[PDB]
Design an enzyme around this catalytic site. Structure first.
Site, PDB file in Angstrom:
ATOM      1  N   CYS D  41       0.842  -1.228   0.000  1.00 35.93           N
ATOM      2  CA  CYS D  41       0.000   0.000   0.000  1.00 35.93           C
ATOM      3  C   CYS D  41       0.871   1.271   0.000  1.00 35.93           C
ATOM      4  O   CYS D  41       1.212   1.742   1.028  1.00 35.93           O
ATOM      5  CB  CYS D  41      -0.927  -0.041   1.215  1.00 35.93           C
ATOM      6  SG  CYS D  41      -1.950   1.429   1.429  1.00 35.93           S
ATOM      7  N   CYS D  44      -0.348   4.127   2.095  1.00 40.12           N
ATOM      8  CA  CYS D  44      -0.108   3.833   3.544  1.00 40.12           C
ATOM      9  C   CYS D  44       1.324   4.300   3.915  1.00 40.12           C
ATOM     10  O   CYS D  44       1.528   4.990   4.969  1.00 40.12           O
ATOM     11  CB  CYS D  44      -0.319   2.353   3.884  1.00 40.12           C
ATOM     12  SG  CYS D  44      -1.990   1.748   3.521  1.00 40.12           S
TER      13      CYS D  44
END
Lengths: 121, 122, 121, 121
Positions: D41, D44
């Site tokens: 991700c 993220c």
């Protein structure tokens, strides 16, 4: 030798292209020249590679060498070369057969085998 | 129909490409889709059906690799494996390319019905 | 805020440095951005926010020169004016330096928050 | 410093939340990081440092729960426990949320320094 045309700017390019619309056209888009200083390093690297591979082009081809203008003109995201519906230039150098998928950009224009493939078929 | 492979990300593309190295390969690079088939790449959404209805023009025994490059956040990274690959040298999605050749279409040219036909046509 | 100058290329850097010779000069050397604000130098992209949030540690009258060295093709040239300059002697981008001193950070060290703070403070 | 809890998966998240139900909870939901490596991700990875440098703006009693939802394949499952939870109702990672409130940031907003400061303040 293969016929070569040297033009500066979009109007001069357009005249050359329209007067050769019946022919096998290859076009190199490069930065303009301090006469003997191009602002485009990858353009300078590409020229000799393109020059030694032009012999692989079919006999009656036409090579248009197009100087796009100064760096500031080229950096303009709305300049005529970038917005042209056929050229759609994203960078210099570009090697293209107008109106086809055949296109090389940046370092690929100094890649001897890809430049040979581009001219040869 | 023409053989099609659907791959997600660089390692999966690399496997399809190396297992088809003896073949006539066409590759489309596009943004990954969501769970409702929803795409972050509007030019990719536009190109898909134009490419779909022109694949029939590819030679017999061609292989069409549909490669999702990943999420926007992956793609936005200017150093990502697809942009830095010495053969693919991707500058945008969508890209239609015959790897290792000058045959390339990008962005709205991937939804140009005549350029896409010309790209497949042999 | 600290005074900042944004320059593109060697001639513009040279003007800024010579017009600030009586001042506390910090200089970041980075790859040029595209119209897109996008960089070819991933270590440069990672460093600019770290440097931006640590510049407040510099003495109040300092001058921060943000120098874009040019395109990748210009930079790759191992004999380019930045690499050959007797004072800058740049070996890579990004470089953070106080010209004519031993104070220098390169590559990932330009995104090291404690070393960047130490550099300015 | 603010109290932090690092949990992997829904059951671990549920235990941390239930054992802190008396407190002002902030929760970040991100992708798992594979053995010797980063997450799957990217948004993220971008959010983590922005969040870490704004946690000081959180109130007195606060508890920050860092929750890895699992592998990409688990997360892409539209019926997974995090997406179906009647309070969390997760739609994506990263998500920053104060459970059972309208306070929620998603995707690039989790790396927006001002929205993250606002969320903690």
């Amino acid at each position: 030798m293969v016929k070569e045309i040297h033009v500066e700017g979009f109007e001069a390019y357009s005249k050359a292209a329209e007067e050769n619309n019946g022919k096998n056209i290859f076009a190199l888009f490069c930065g303009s020249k301090a006469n003997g200083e191009s602002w485009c390093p990858d353009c300078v690297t590409a020229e000799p590679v393109i020059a030694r591979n032009l012999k692989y082009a079919p006999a009656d081809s036409v090579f248009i060498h197009c100087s796009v203008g100064e760096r500031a003109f080229w950096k303009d995201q709305s300049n005529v070369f970038r917005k042209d519906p056929v050229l759609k230039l994203k960078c210099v150098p570009t090697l293209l057969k107008p109106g086809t998928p055949q296109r090389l950009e940046e370092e690929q224009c100094a890649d001897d085998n890809l430049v040979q493939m581009f001219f040869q078929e």
